[PDB]
Design a protein around this ligand. Structure first.
Ligand SMILES: Cn1cc(-c2cncnc2N)c2ccc(Cl)c(Cl)c21
Length: 327
């Protein structure tokens, strides 16, 4: 840091670390000290290739949507330095995860959620049109355009509030075209779809599951899947949404998870009781039974349909009642 790359970008600060490497903030000395973000990919095969893929994906999408009408991050250039791939991006604000966290996990206000959601659904339906599936949607990969605030007070402390809740989607290193190889395991665990967990094959619907999981988190301020074990994650889905359908059970080869034709889960085990305590039927999560909240929850529920063929598409989701107050 103070390190110069490409003889124009001076690292000032670190914005993010990760599997792939890091994202830093740089001053661009040839663009009148204006500021950008640079992703510095680890010098490691699987990350260079995800980065190579990210770049091809993002050139296609810059070609198709040069003005980020569909809210993907804009890549400005790429180069190499000490055999790290380096991707220059427009400078964004905080992730939606970082923002919530830095508010003490105070959920987002429903008006901001409606909007943020609409943008995320717009962005990813645009990928789904170009035969891409993101595979790793989560609040860490949805970032505010800038995250500026008002230090307003409240009697249930000094929270920050969103003037402008515009988002972009980031992280296209895992985005998979329909005609390409599909990795066996995608998504971060808490945002991962049952078809992925059961190894049924996946495609575009898996992103919709993830989106459902994100909206729940924006609303609750915490995850409804607080787990790192696959079977328990399934037991949690059941407690929140009812039994898995027979034909998904019949079709999976993850036999380990099942006894006779039912999840091999003892509800009265220690793990059983942890699930019963942290998880309950979806709608019992609602903090008010007014009309708007019933609509969010009708959507979420549709995004959390077990059967990927039956699950709502983002085409359909973009015409959900929940989205009216926007026009
Ligand atoms: C802080 N930050 C993190 C990423 C990022 C990259 N890849 C995978 N997950 C991520 N979160 C990222 C991508 C573009 C931009 Cl402009 C910023 Cl400011 C970014």
């Amino acid at each position: 840091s103070g390190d110069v790359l490409s003889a124009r970008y001076e690292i000032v600060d670190t914005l993010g670390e990760g599997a792939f490497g890091k994202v830093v903030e740089c001053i661009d000395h040839k663009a009148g000290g204006r500021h950008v973000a640079v992703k510095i990919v680890k010098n490691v095969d699987r990350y260079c290739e995800a980065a190579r893929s990210e770049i091809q994906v993002l050139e296609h999408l810059n070609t198709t949507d040069p003005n980020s009408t569909f809210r993907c991050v804009q890549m400005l250039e790429w180069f190499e330095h000490h055999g790290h791939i380096c991707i220059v991006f427009e400078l964004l604000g905080l992730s939606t995860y970082d923002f919530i966290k830095e508010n003490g996990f105070l959920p987002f206000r429903l008006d901001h959620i409606r909007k943020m959601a609409y943008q995320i659904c717009k962005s990813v339906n645009f990928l789904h049109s170009n035969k891409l599936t993101h595979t790793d949607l989560k609040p860490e990969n949805i970032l505010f355009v800038q995250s500026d605030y008002t230090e307003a007070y409240n009697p249930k402390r000094d929270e920050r509030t969103l003037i402008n809740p515009d988002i972009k989607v980031v992280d296209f290193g895992s985005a998979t075209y329909d005609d390409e190889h599909h990795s066996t395991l995608v998504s971060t665990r808490h945002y991962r779809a049952p078809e992925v967990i059961l190894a049924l094959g996946w495609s575009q619907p898996c992103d919709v599951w993830s989106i459902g999981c994100i909206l729940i988190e924006y609303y609750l301020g915490f995850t409804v899947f607080p787990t790192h074990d696959s079977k328990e994650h399934l037991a949690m889905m059941e407690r929140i949404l009812g039994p898995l359908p027979k034909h998904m059970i019949q079709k999976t080869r993850k036999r380990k998870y099942f006894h006779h034709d039912r999840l091999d889960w003892d509800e009265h085990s220690s793990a059983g009781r942890y699930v019963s305590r942290r998880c309950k039927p979806l709608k019992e999560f609602m903090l008010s039974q007014d009309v708007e909240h019933e609509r969010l929850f009708d959507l979420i529920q549709k995004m959390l349909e077990y059967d990927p063929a039956k699950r709502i598409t983002l085409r359909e989701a973009l015409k959900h009642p929940f989205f009216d107050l926007l026009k």
